[PDB]
Each structure stands twice: as C-alpha cells, then as structure tokens.
Amino acid sequence: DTAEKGEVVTKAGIPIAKQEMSREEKLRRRRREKERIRKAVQSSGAYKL
Amino acid sequence: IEELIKRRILAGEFDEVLRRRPDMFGNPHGVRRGLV
Amino acid sequence: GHSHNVLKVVWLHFASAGADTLVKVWDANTGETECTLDNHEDRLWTLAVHSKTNILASAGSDSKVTFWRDTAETQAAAAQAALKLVEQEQTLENYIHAGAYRDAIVLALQLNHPGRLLNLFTNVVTTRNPDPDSLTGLKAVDDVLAKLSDEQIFQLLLRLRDWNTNARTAPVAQRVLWALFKSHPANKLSSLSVKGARGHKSLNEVLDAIKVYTERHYKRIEELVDESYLVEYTLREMDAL
Amino acid sequence: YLKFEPSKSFGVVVSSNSNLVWSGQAIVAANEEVLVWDIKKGELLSRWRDENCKFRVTAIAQSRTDPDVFAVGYEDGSIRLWDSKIATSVVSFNGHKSAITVLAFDKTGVRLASGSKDTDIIVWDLVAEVGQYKLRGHKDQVTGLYFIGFLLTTGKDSLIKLWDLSSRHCIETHVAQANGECWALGVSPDFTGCITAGNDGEITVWALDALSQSVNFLQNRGTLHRSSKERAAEVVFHPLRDYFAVHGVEKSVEIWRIREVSDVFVQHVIVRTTGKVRSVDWALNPGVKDLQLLVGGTNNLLELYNIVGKDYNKALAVELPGHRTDIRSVAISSDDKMLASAANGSLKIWNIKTQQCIRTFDCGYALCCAFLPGDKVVIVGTKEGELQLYDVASASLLETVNAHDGHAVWALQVHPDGRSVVSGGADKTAKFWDFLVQSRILKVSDDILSLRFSPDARLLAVALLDSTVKVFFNDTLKLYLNLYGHKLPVLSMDISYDSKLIVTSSADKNIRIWGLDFGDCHKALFGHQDSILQVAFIPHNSDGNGHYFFSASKDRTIKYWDADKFEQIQRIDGHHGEIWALAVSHSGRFLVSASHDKSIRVWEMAGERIAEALELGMTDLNTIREWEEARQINPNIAPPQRNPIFVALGNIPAETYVLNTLQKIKPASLHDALLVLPFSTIPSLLTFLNLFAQRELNVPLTCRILFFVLKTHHKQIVASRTMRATLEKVRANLRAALRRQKDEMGFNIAALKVVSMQLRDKSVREYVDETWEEKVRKRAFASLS
RNA sequence: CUAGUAAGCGCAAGUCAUCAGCUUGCGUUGAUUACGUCCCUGCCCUUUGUACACACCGCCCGUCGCUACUACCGAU
RNA sequence: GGAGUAUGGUCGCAAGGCUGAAAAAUUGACGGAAGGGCACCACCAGGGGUGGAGCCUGCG
C-alpha cells in the first residue's frame, strides 16, 4: 500500500520493478501469491458444413 | 452407510463443532492486537 | 460535459465550443472527450476548422482568437520514446554482460530499476580489486556519485531506506550511504527540493527512518567489536604459552 | 475381432504448411510425410512418412553443402533429419515444447537453430547429436532465423535480435513495426542487408556490417511499403541474381529487383495466381536464363513460373494427382477397383490398386456423388440446386437438370435394385427420379439433412432439420414411424444390411441405436467429442461382423463399434482435418476416408555437507595458489583445472561457494553443525574465516561462527602451535574489516544527525504571532486486554 | 508393552445390555530396559493469514488450469 | 355461544411421458525440495504372549 507505481516490494522488503522483472519470476511470484490465497436458429450451411 | 457417507461428503456439511473464538463475548468483532 | 450551451459544433477533418468557454473535442464512435482548451474567457460564440489539416480557432464574447493545431501524435512520440527505451534497456543488459559497471549504474539511474541497480551496488562494493583511494572501490563510480542530480539523489534515498530496512543489503546500503555524504555538501543536502516528497515519501520521514535503522546496525556492530576482542585475548594467551 | 490399420493414404499435394524447397525436384510437405515430386513430370519420387510420429510436419529445410539430408520439424516440437538417398530419418531432435516453425542451418551444416511456436530457439550439434544450448529472449514466438558466430532473428512482437554464439546471450535488439508485428525476414546472401516485412505491408530495410562501448552493427536504413496490405508470409532472396520475392497469402505475389531505399528497391513484377499461395521457393534450373519461382498453393497445388531477368507465365504445375478445393463426396465403385471423389469445382475418379487418379471433371460445387449400378455413369448433386450426370468411359457430362431450384440437394441415394434414384434438397420437397424422369415428389414442413433406402427395398427414411426422422415404406410413402430425441439436427443415419437396426448420429455429439420394429432406441451412445458427420455399417455379414459400424466425426476421428454389444471395439485416428466423407467396401474388407486434410486414407546431513564443502574449497584454494605460483614463474599456458562441479556452477569462487553453503541454513542448525565439525576440520574452517575476513562478506555470520568455534574449542586452540599464525592473520584481517565498516557507518550516523538538525533549522517556522500552538507521529497498539 | 507399567498368585461379586466353556472387580509380591532421537518407516504441519520488543531471517519449485488482452487459421 | 386443542370422515391441488438401467472457478488440480514436531502402528534397549500338544467359546 505504500509502494511506488512501477515496482512491487518483496517479502524481504525489496521494491522490484515489474518492468525489469522477466516472465519467469513473474509466473513464480504469481504462483506464490495464488498459493497464499489457496492456503487462505442456424443455417443448414452451418449445420452440414 | 457407504452411500450416505458419500452423500454428505459430496454435499459436504458437518454436524461437528467448530473452534469458537475463545473470548467471543467482550471481543465479538476481533481486531488484531496490533498496529492500526 | 457542458455547464452552458454549446452554440456551435464543427465537424472534424465532434467539436463543441460555446458559452462554457472550455472547448471539447471527441469522435462519436467512442464519444469521450479528447481535449479541453482554456485560452478563452467567460463566453464563447463561434468556431472554425482548417480546410485540410486540423487547426481550431477559438473566439467568443471577447476579441481573443486562439488557434489550436494538432492521440496520433501522442502515439508517434510514444513510439520513438519506446525505441529509445528498448535501445537503452538492451545496452544496459549488455553493460551487465560486459560488467560495464559505472555506465551501467548511470543507465540504471536513468531507467530507475533499483534491483539491477543494487546488484551493481553489490559488485561495486565487492569488486575484489577495489581502488585504494576509492570510496566504493571504483573511482569512476565515485565520480558519478559526485555528479548526481537532485531528484535522482532523492529517489536513491528511497531505494536506500529500503536497502537499509533489510539487513543483508544493509551494509551495501551503508556504503552507498557512506559515499553519498562525502561527495555532496550539507547545505546542498538541506536545500534539496524535489516535488515528490509528500506524506510517507517526504524527506524528514525517509531520513529519520534511515537514521533509526543505522542506529540498530551501529549497536550491532559495536557488540561485534566488543566480542571480537576475544581473539586478541587468546593471542595473548598463546603468547604466554 | 479383426482390426483396421492405416494402409493407404493419398489424394493430396502440399497442405497449408510453409517452407517448401526445390532441389529439378520439388520437396514439399504433406501432413505427416515429407514428399518429393517432379515438376515437369507429374510423378512424385517419394514420401517421408515416419511411423513413429503422427504429428503434422510444418517446417522443411535443406542443408547447405549437403543435399539429400533434410531437417524437418513437426507439430510436437520434433526435428527429423532424413535422407533422400534412403527414405528414412537419421536423427530426431525433440527439445521444443510445441510446433516447430522456423529453422536455420549452418553454412557448413554442423549447427542447427530451431525456433518454434513455443518461442524457444534451440541450437543443436550434428556430430555430437546434442542440443548445444537454449536461447531465451523473445516476448513472443519467433518468425525468422539466420546464421551470421552470430544469429539474426525476428519474432512476433516485431522484434529483431542479434545474438552471439561464443557468448550465449543477446547482443542487440530493435523493433521493426512501430505499432504492429513483423512477419517475414529476408537476408541478403552477402550479409549486407536485411528486410523485415510486417503486418501493414510494411518492409523495414536495414544495413549490416561484417564490447563495453556503444556497439552498433545494424542500421535502419529506412522503410518501404508494398501494394497488398496483408501480413507477409515469406520474403525469399535469389541465391545468385539480384532479385527477391515478397508474398503474403493472397492471389498476388510481388517480385522485386536489386539495382534512397525507394530508389534502390522497385517492384520487378506483380504476379497474379489462381489460388492463395502457402509458400514461394526459388529454383535455378541447370542451363536456363530464367528465374523459376515455385509457388506451393494452399488449394492443393504446385505451380512453377518463369520470370525473365531483364513477366510471368504458367510454366509447370502439379494438380493432377489430387483435387483442389475440398472433398465433399465419395463413391467407391461396385467392383471396388475404382472410386469417385467430389470436391468443390473438381471431381476425380481414382483407381485403388495404384491409389492414383485416372480421370478429372469440372463443375461449380459438389455435394453428393454416386455411380449407378454397372459402374458406367456417375450422378452428382450441387449447391446451386442442381443435378449433373457424367460417365466414366467417355469422360464427359451426360445430363444437367435443376431438380430443386437453388436448394442444396442434401441427399442422393440409388435404389438398391438399381432403377431409381432419390434426391433430397434444401426445399420442402424431395424427388424420386426413375431411370431419367421424375417419378414422384414428396412435400414436408422443413429441410431434410439425410435420407436412406432399406437394404431390402421395403422401407425408406427421410431425416429432417427439426431434429426428427420420418421413416416410410418404399412402395407408398406412408409414415411407418418417426424418431426423435436429439436436441440438435441429425447429420447422418445408417440401417443394418438386414434392416433390423438403425444408427442415427446427430450434432449433439451422440448416436442412437434403434430397432426398425417399433423403432425403439436400443442404446443412446455419447462417444465422440464433436459433431459426428457420418456412420456406416458393413452389408456383408459373410465374415460374421455385419452389425459392426464406423462413426466418423469432426474432431478428426472415427470409431469402430459393434452394435450387438453396443461397444467401441476400436478407435481410428490418423486424420488432422475435419472429415467429410468415407465409404465402406462392399465386401467390407477396407474403407476409405476423405477429410479436411484434403486427403483420403484407406484402412484394412548439513554438518557433513558444509564439512566436505569446505574440503572441496580447500582443494580449490590449493589449486589457485599453485596456479598463481605457476603464472608468477612464467605467463605460459597453465589451466586451473578446477573442480568439474565448480566450473559447472559457473567458475565461481570457492570461498563464495562455501559462503553460500554457510548462508543457506538456519542459525540453529548452523550452531549445531559447527558444534559437530571435528578438530581436523577446524583449521580449514578457520582459514576460510580468514578468507571471508579479508574478503568481507556476511560480517555478523563470520563473527558469530568465529566466537562459537572459539568457545567450543578454546583449550585446543591455546594449546596448539600452528593455529597461532593463522589466528594472528585472521585477527589482523578481522580488526581491519570491523574497523573499516564501523567507521563507515559512524560517518553515516553522524551525517544523519547533522542533516536532521539542518533540515529542522530549514523547516522550523516563518511567521511569528501570538499562536505557538501549531508547533508528531502516532501508532496504535491494540491490546485484547 | 516405559512406574504401581509386565508377569505370577490367589479371594470375592455375578450389576437389565454382553459374560459362566467365563466376565468383572479387589488385595498381595513387584522388577529389567529405555525414558535419547527424528537417521529407517512413517504420520502431522510448516513456505498464507493469527499481537508490536530488544533478536533472526530474507521474495521455495514444478506442471498446468481458469480469467483479460493480442494476433492467426480456414471453411459457411 | 367465543377461544383454542385434538380425532378421523368429505372435496381441490399436487397426479400428463422429447422418453426408454449403467459442474463451478481470478479461489481450481496434482506433486516435489528445504524446516520442525511426533510415534512402542518408528529406530535403540529389553520383556512377554500367541503360533508346538490337548480342551474349547467365538469368527470362515
């Protein structure tokens, strides 16, 4: 809630940018957050063709 | 027996008690003892 | 969208301009306002469109006439800016590949991603071959911290309070905290004035935050000294033996 | 319980996969076989049909400096290197996730880059038979590969990228289309220029040249635009002359020559085609002054054109051994020696034992095709409402009659005696034609989708748009009964050879097994994942299997069932396109199946952990100090020959490694492990503490572990002799380290105090009045008591 | 099967239900051997949420799915 | 006569066969590696049955 716009903070407390983040740790971060949540009449032409 | 077991776990509803919050009376709402 | 009457539309190539004195343009397929131009005073009477290009001429109850030549130019400027962005990001990545530390820090300062910036900070505080007169270990990096600009310093104070908040990155935060104070004078630091210091991001707050984290680390390292005296004790012991 | 196998497969030339190759031979791609044809002659030399794979191949490529070995790439991510000398694949390369699309050879032919729909580009060795390494950029899948060593690539975010080979990372990228995607990459054969054709018909043109500084190799020398504002499929160069070809999938291709970028690059010719090209390809024929442009066209054809080098003409074509648009009907002759096939515009009759087309005829559209008994004439019905009558012997049309007006005649069935035919249109009537004259029409409320006779000429059955079926008698057309119970309109029906049974398959993805006496549904069967188009019994129960039947469905699959036990006895896979027709042998020995493949197939510890980690680190330190002695004696070639695990972990420092194996675990088990560490391991550990003391990393960790090993071994330490020197050295190093860092952060905190004071003195107050009342953070700390 | 725990011994009562081919009480004599450990087999649960200090740590991983967007493919 | 409370008698509806036995979902599905706790259905130390002969209830 106190973070800046283009970046996100970690559980360590490190603000890291979505822009600099690659898809790999993107999916991994989304996976960890999802795991936190988890622990919480027509035509005859159309018919015959 | 087996099918009624199957039935209740399917439409899973349990007569068993839940852990009541330990001091429901004076603290019915229950904010954390933390920073606000 | 009007508080007053519109009194004329002209067609593009939707343009409302009337007694409310704020003109408003849009295209009807979306129907949402594309500009609002307020060179004009209380009441606005008429309107005109350029024959071929798109320049507007606002004129009303006054005798002021103002022309407004030309979404698409915004897309064009964003396109060239994004070409610049991807070029500088790729050469930043190649600076990482080469280990081009100083200019890598420079380009990371412009592009504002503190994570890769901090990885550069780890490398530059631990080069394994630091320059003797240097502050971080690399004198050109000492030069770039000598020639920082104000808003960049302030945002580094933000990244710095964060790297100070976490403890494994506290010492690398302390060294870049340490070289920062040596370079630039205190009157400059106090007369620092950037627009984005409001509430939790204001200067008093972020500063005293850094202060209390450093005070914790200060007491910690003091205890480390006091317990470190034991090896001198045992050295005296084996000297007796 | 006899089973069916993929026995014959034919009736098609090159599908909608790209990247065909010329060698006077044309290696084109079918679905599963990679097949080579002659262009002057209509006869194919061979096909490359691998039994181990089923997937549709979609990338073909010829090795430079090595013809007759070819690398192909399938739908599953596989790369099969085949031989043309022997119709077999020498090697298979399955590293990708899905759908090989773009390939690039080495100029020598030992190195292979493959890029897929799964966005990966994998480089492979061709003498060690391993994927060399994996290259990962590319926010979306790739479009173009080339071997410059270096790699020049482009991908679907309009991104062009140059990578290095010696350094497996990207070196440069740029963007082709401002607000679109690139679609085609063309490299000049001398490595001097590259052209990138994107969505808007826009071809960005770039020049080339053959690390810490501002490297710039590629230059955007400009843009160009073509005539057709379509996505461009391929831009192929001339290997020898100064020409190249741009095509997006249309009836228009453009050849452009090489002499501002508009001044240099002008269209040579714009060629118009009869169909939409899938892929263009080049050919130099031996002994000609011409440019042989081979177009492989999506409407099942090949066409070789001549371009004069300082116009176009249809020089050659392959369209005879296949149809052209889409097969829509079948009729396998009574002798089971030939068949009829009806497609939109083309009808071809084919001999089975040579599995080859014999004759070809033209029409507008074709719904249904069926010979008459004696196999002399064929009856075809078409979308324009019309019936045409051809023959097989004289190869001509006989008659042409508007049966219904423009209503698509959904049904043509012969009378099983062989004297009448029946024709069911999209209108509200359907007509019996005795041969030919119109015997009798029938009127009903809605459109019919299927009708049949009974194998004993006793009953007839119509089957309508209303998801209903009305069965009548054959002699007078009075309603025997009617079947319902499908929610969607029926697509087909088939009754048993003894007329004791019905199967009624509808677009509800299920079939109904009825009885023909009282017409009771013996079984509803929900067994296809899609709308089953057709179903057919065998008439010959002479094998004892007459109540077996095949059900062919839109999701490219047929199932062989037994109605008696109501069970699917077999699944028949094999097609990769929506099946439209099929036909059963009259003896029932084989079947044919024609599909939207446009093809036809015929079927018959932690303490010891950090301890030995320390030990390996000691070995590495000994190697490094002996290597330093060697390079100090002479700067000659002396390799460190470090641990394989260390050079695999990335030439990392051994002290960094043991710092990691020290940094991972918890404080408690750390304390525990160092308590375990024996006194033989203590000097190695202490020397590593010395290394961390000089190379200061994780200061409180090093200090804490130092103190702990002192307190668990102190008397041994003060009793020993050799440790005294090591303790002196680490002591000097640690005092240096601690003093440096403490003075650093003390400088920090003093500066913090003074900047606090001056910022206060800045911010204090400006106005002075009677109100000093205006001159604090707050926190909450809830407590449940 | 780890402290009045195991075994041995008896004397009684016969508790609506079950138990005399026994069951249940209650007294008597009363030990070895552990009483550590998560290494085997395991089982449970941490990697979310749940109160703040001085203190420590420092963004597990996978295959997919689902939702939004992009563009494609070809029939009718 | 009013109010309930019952007991069963009476009537209306429920009581008209496109039929013929065998999902939801931003939260979802399954795993794996590190970290602890536990256990006489685990280790370690020991003991003691039953299982040998016979009697015999009960269970098949």
Please measure the distance between the N-terminal and C-terminal CA atoms of chain A and give it in whole angstroms: 55
The dihedrals phi and psi of D707, each to the nearest 5 degrees, come to: -60, -40
**Which residues on A lie below 8 Å from D410 (Cβ)?**
44, 48
Q: List the chains bordering chain A where 3 or more Cβ pairs fall under 8 Å.
A: C, D
Asked whether the beta carbons of C142 and C134 are under 8 A apart, the reply is yes
DSSP string, D56-72: PP-EEEEETTEEEEEEE
Q: How far apart are CA D232 and CA D182, in angstroms?
A: 8
A:10-39 Cβ neighbours of strand E under 7 Å = 10-14, 16, 21, 24-25, 27-29, 31-32, 34-36, 39
Q: How far apart are CA C151 and CA C153, in angstroms?
A: 5
**Which residues on D lie below 8 Å from A45 (Cβ)?**
408
Residues for chain C: how many in total? Answer: 241
DSSP annotation of C49 reads: B
Q: How far apart are CA A31 and CA A10, in angstroms?
A: 14
Asked whether the beta carbons of D561 and D541 are under 8 A apart, the reply is no
Rounded to whole angstroms, what are the CA distances from C91 to C79, C103, C109?
A: 18, 10, 14
Output the six-digit token pair for D241: 């002359």
DSSP annotation of D176 reads: S
Output the six-digit token pair for A34: 């999802």
Give A26 CA → F27 C1' in Å.
Answer: 19
Q: Where are the beta strands (DSSP E) in chain C?
A: 9-10, 15-16, 23-25, 35-37, 55-58, 66-69
Q: Which residues contact D529 (CB under 8 A, 6 or more apart)?
A: D509, D553, D555, D557
Closest Cα to residue D424, out of D477, D374, D373, D475? Answer: D477
B-to-D residue pairs, Cβ atoms closer than 8 angstroms = 17
Question: Which residue bears the tokens 């330990």?
Answer: B22
**Amino acid identity, residue D285?**
N
Q: Do C208 and D751 touch (CB under 8 A)?
A: no
Please write down the HEC assignment for all residues of D293-341.
EEEEECCCEEEEEEECCCCEEEEEEECCCCCCCCEEEEEECCCCCEEEE
Query: Helix or strand or coil: residue D33?
Result: strand
Q: How far apart are CA C182 and CA D396, in angstroms?
A: 100
Q: Do A13 and C165 touch (CB under 8 A)?
A: yes
Q: How far apart are CA D782 and CA D392, in angstroms?
A: 96
Query: Helix or strand or coil: residue C75?
Result: helix
Q: How far apart are CA D326 and CA D448, in angstroms?
A: 23
Output the six-digit token pair for A47: 């018919």
Over its C-alpha atoms, chain D yields an Rg (Å, rounded) of 39
CA C240 remoteness from chain centre: 61
Query: Helix or strand or coil: residue C74?
Result: helix
The dihedrals phi and psi of D734, each to the nearest 5 degrees, come to: -75, -40
Query: By CA distance, what is D784's nearest residue in B?
Result: B33
Over its C-alpha atoms, chain C yields an Rg (Å, rounded) of 29
Q: How far apart are CA D178 and CA D182, in angstroms?
A: 10
D:565-624 Cβ neighbours of strand F under 7 Å = 606
Output the six-digit token pair for D530: 């899609």
Rounded to whole angstroms, what are the CA distances from D339 to D331, D352, D373, D497?
A: 5, 7, 13, 22
CB half-sphere exposure, D141, CA atoms < 13 A? 13
Question: Which residue bears the tokens 């076989």?
Answer: D33
Output the six-digit token pair for D707: 């103190």
Output the six-digit token pair for D621: 């330190």
Please measure the distance between the N-terminal and C-terminal CA atoms of chain D and give it in whole angstroms: 81
**Which residues on A lie below 8 Å from D408 (Cβ)?**
44-45, 48
Q: Which residues contact D372 (CB under 8 A, 6 or more apart)?
A: D378, D379, D414, D418, D421, D435
DSSP annotation of D230 reads: S
Give B6 CA → F21 C1' in Å.
Answer: 21
Q: How far apart are CA D170 and CA D151, in angstroms?
A: 9
Say if strands D202-207 and D219-225 run parallel, antiparallel, or are unpaired. antiparallel
Output the six-digit token pair for D239: 């290997």
Q: Do C200 and A16 touch (CB under 8 A)?
A: no
The H or E element that residue D741 is part of is helix D722-763
Q: Which residues contact C172 (CB under 8 A, 6 or more apart)?
A: C118, C121, C122, C125, C163
Residues for chain B: how many in total? Answer: 36
**Which residues on C lie below 8 Å from D172 (Cβ)?**
90, 94
CA C223 remoteness from chain centre: 38
Q: How far apart are CA D744 and CA C171, in angstroms?
A: 10
Angle C156-C158-C159 (CA atoms, 0-180°, nearest 5)?
65
Q: How far apart are CA A9 and CA A22, in angstroms?
A: 15
Beta-sheet strand order (sheet of D523-525) = D490-495, D502-506, D510-514, D523-525
Closest Cα to residue C8, out of C53, C51, C54, C60? Answer: C60
Of B27, B35, B36, the CB nearest to D784: B27
Asked whether the beta carbons of A34 and A45 are under 8 A apart, the reply is no
Q: How far apart are CA D743 and CA D735, in angstroms?
A: 12
Task: For residue D27, list its beta bridge partners.
Answer: D21, D36
Rounded to whole angstroms, what are the CA distances from D423 to D87, D382, D401?
A: 47, 11, 12
User: Does at least one atom of strand E sit less than 7 Å from the CB of D576?
Assistant: no
Q: Which residues contact D518 (CB under 8 A, 6 or more apart)?
A: D481
**Which residues on A lie below 8 Å from C118 (Cβ)?**
14
Closest Cα to residue D411, out of D458, D460, D362? Answer: D460
Q: Do A44 and D507 touch (CB under 8 A)?
A: no
Largest CA distance in chain D: 123
Give D220 CA → E49 C1' in Å.
Answer: 54
The H or E element that residue D733 is part of is helix D722-763
Please write down the HEC assignment for all residues of D129-165.
CCEEEEECCCCCCEEEEEECCEEEEEECCCEEEEEEC
Q: How far apart are CA D591 and CA D2, in angstroms?
A: 14
Asked whether the beta carbons of D327 and D342 are under 8 A apart, the reply is yes
- Data resolution in angstroms: 4.4
Output the six-digit token pair for D571: 């699944």
Say if strands D202-207 and D193-198 run parallel, antiparallel, or are unpaired. antiparallel
Q: Do C115 and A2 touch (CB under 8 A)?
A: no
Largest CA distance in chain C: 106
The dihedrals phi and psi of C197, each to the nearest 5 degrees, come to: -125, 80
CA D669 remoteness from chain centre: 50
Asked whether the beta carbons of D12 and D597 are under 8 A apart, the reply is yes
* CB atoms inside a 10 Å sphere around CB B23: 11
- The dihedral formed by the CA atoms of C134, C139, C141 and C143, expressed in degrees to the nearest 10: 110
Q: How far apart are CA D380 and CA D376, in angstroms?
A: 14
Output the six-digit token pair for D624: 């490094």
Query: By CA distance, what is D410's nearest residue in A?
Result: A48
Q: How far apart are CA C21 and CA C23, in angstroms?
A: 6
Which strand E bases fall within 7 angstroms of a protein CB? 46-52, 54-65, 71-76
Query: By CA distance, what is A14's nearest residue in C?
Result: C162
Asked whether the beta carbons of D686 and D734 are under 8 A apart, the reply is no
Q: How far apart are CA C55 and CA C38, in angstroms?
A: 15
CA D721 remoteness from chain centre: 70
Q: How far apart are CA D511 and CA D553, in angstroms?
A: 11
Give B1 CA → E18 C1' in Å.
Answer: 25
User: Does at least one atom of strand F sit less than 7 Å from the CB of D482?
Assistant: no
Asked whether the beta carbons of D198 and D183 are under 8 A apart, the reply is yes
Asked whether the beta carbons of C175 and D744 are under 8 A apart, the reply is yes
Over its C-alpha atoms, chain A yields an Rg (Å, rounded) of 21
**Whether B20 contacts chain D with CB within 8 A:** no
DSSP annotation of D372 reads: P
Q: How far apart are CA C90 and CA D159, in angstroms?
A: 12
Please write down the HEC assignment for all residues of C79-136.
HHHHHHHHHHHHHHHHHHHHCCHHHHHHHHHHHCCHHHHHHHHHHHHCCCCCCCCCCC
Of D700, D748, D758, the CB nearest to C224: D700
Q: Do D173 and C126 touch (CB under 8 A)?
A: no
Q: How far apart are CA D537 and CA D264, in angstroms?
A: 67
* CB atoms inside a 10 Å sphere around CB D260: 7
Output the six-digit token pair for D471: 């069965």
Q: Which nucleotide is nearest to A25 (CA to C1')?
A: E59
DSSP annotation of D529 reads: S
Query: By CA distance, what is D785's nearest residue in B?
Result: B33
Output the six-digit token pair for C158: 């933000």
**Amino acid identity, residue D587?**
S
Question: Which residue bears the tokens 């773009």?
Answer: D102
Helix pair angle (D722-763, D682-694), 10° resolution: 40
